[model samples]
Target: GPLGSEEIKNIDAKIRKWSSGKSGNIRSLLSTLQYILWSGSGWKPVPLMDMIEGNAVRKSYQRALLILHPDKLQQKGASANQKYMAEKVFELLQEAWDHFNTLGP
Candidate 1:
């Protein structure tokens, strides 16, 4: 099925928001992407929406880093499981950023 321009726009906006960090922090964004990937919804190829939202992405990444930083994690006394999860999401976030940085909008 062909996507209408409006639907495409909205999809683009949504993807933009997720990559932009307007959707939420790394954890939230990762969950959203996971759902989109696994929910059987049609795959929509969004370009470097991440690059387009680079500034917001950077800020969001920084925020996630601060929250998940080793010092902060230790200070908060996060459980082993919690630390593990944070690290996983943090790795994904950085990988996504690297991918986006290499692409064009």
Candidate 2:
């Protein structure tokens, strides 16, 4: 479980960086996610979120926090008090960006 534990820790670190202070508003989260998914990371659109589902990676991102906290199913009822979520997403976005950048032409 070391890898799994490490991934969790890494995600936690990212959440800390992204949600440094900003409110955990979904709009705000989308703003950051959009930037990362597009300009920051250059993730392919097809593999990204689609009208239909089955993309595990994208799905993982969308429900990352929820996976960690399954009880918070009701988005409206749930509180976005956890600053770590945003930070983790932002960090992952940047990391994806860097990883993509390292590829040779």
Candidate 3:
């Protein structure tokens, strides 16, 4: 319904960051990222294939991305574990998104 994966493609693989919610492989991480990114976005976790559209996924990820960014986390005095978790989760999301992009709908 939107510009396909345009916005997502604009994301240059960010430099190394730290933190996740859970430990898993590509497929698992993708799904988990959706759930965690959905954080307060009010969306429920769905099947990986269900996330074929990058529009919605990108928006959700973007929301959490900034909130968890290093600068913001540090300013708020978040714990190291919290910062590390956010970094790891972001990297996992990035990894899965690459594969998701390649085999996109």
Candidate 4:
């Protein structure tokens, strides 16, 4: 239940370097995943351990965004069933964030 020194250092250094369009893109993807998957909190580990394996995570996150954008999120000519998904997503994002903060070796 504790993040070791190296993990804290890695996370802190990452937060400091968390600028540029790349981090922004990753945030968006994480947000999108938080929205779409119940198990999204567990998704980061797989990608974190394999970031250089052909940029697959980056591409997948982008694709997920295209599917979740507000203007594009509609199911096409439905009644009004779009309903309160973002709230659930925000909750999940927080859950994911907490999980991320607790990650360790």
Candidate 5:
């Protein structure tokens, strides 16, 4: 129920890696994900654990952006259904960014 220091680092790394763009992440897409992930007031299990590895999480997040940006995100690839799903996730981006940006750690 509580995020210890290690867990916080885990979360911070996920946020940084996704938002930093050096790993082929997108600002808008990272925004989309962080907003959605924090809405539960707890962490989302997808990015919180390494059970499935970060590859799936990256692909899932990256796929959504592919639809959002044809040219920029096109360097990545996705399934047809992923585009539709990404479009759906696309709707959740703009309404986010309220409380999740705070740094308590």
Candidate 6:
């Protein structure tokens, strides 16, 4: 089922708020995003191919991507705030994914 509009709005708003003032060059910002993803939960940095137990890290990363996809939010009348955040998150997630796959251990 589609996410409730209000819930989607709130989630987008929160993601935007959390991501605000997150400016930095690729190296630092990506590291911070990585830290947020890991520290926000109890996860740790590991190789992209290294699955932790139930593959919780990869699952969590994929889940974040789903919430941050701008097209999905826009389809449900998401606000400018929501769209902005989704775009930012989507970009950051893409960079992180790229770096992780190409450069990370």
Specify the highest-lDDT model's number.
6
RMSD, every candidate, angstroms: 14.3, 13.5, 13.1, 14.3, 15.6, 8.9
By lDDT, is 1 or 3 better? 3
Residue ranges of candidate 4 with Cα displaced over 4 Å? 1-54, 78-83, 86-105
Query: Once all C-alphas are superposed, what RMSD does model 5 give against the true structure?
Result: 15.6
lDDT of 3 by residue, 1-105 (tens): 122354333222222221232332344554554444424433355466754566755655565456666787788676655555566566666665566557643
Task: List ranges where model 1 is wrong by over 4 Å.
Answer: 1-52
Of candidates 6 and 1, the better by TM-score = 6
3 or 6, which is superior by lDDT?
6
| lDDT of model number 6 | 0.53
Q: Write the residue-wise lDDT of candidate 6 on 9-100 in tens digits.
A: 76667666655665322333333444443223223444434434334445656655555567666666666654664576678667665665
- In model 4, the Cα lDDT at residue 31 comes to 36
Give the clashing pairs for model 2: 14-87, 14-88, 15-84, 15-87, 15-88, 18-87, 19-87
Clashing pairs in 3: 18-87, 18-88, 19-84, 19-85, 19-87, 19-88, 19-89
Q: How close is candidate 5 to the true structure, as a TM-score?
A: 0.27
For 64-100, candidate 1 gives per-residue lDDT tens digits of 5666566677787766544554454555567665655
Candidate 5, residues 33-74, lDDT tens digits: the string is: 544343332223334443234455455555444445434324
Error in Å for residue 25 of model 6: 12
Better of 5 and 6 by TM-score: 6
How well does each candidate superpose onto the true structure, as a TM-score?
0.46, 0.30, 0.47, 0.30, 0.27, 0.47
Candidate 5 lDDT (Cα, 0 to 1): 0.40
For candidate 4, the lDDT comes to: 0.39
lDDT of 4 by residue, 1-105 (tens): 134566555544543343223332344335335434334323333344443333554554445444444444454321222213433333433443344345411
Deviating ranges (above 4 Å) for candidate 5: 1-73, 98-105
Give the TM-score comparing model 6 with the true structure, all chains together. Answer: 0.47
Query: What are the lDDT figures for the candidates, one per model?
Result: 0.50, 0.40, 0.51, 0.39, 0.40, 0.53
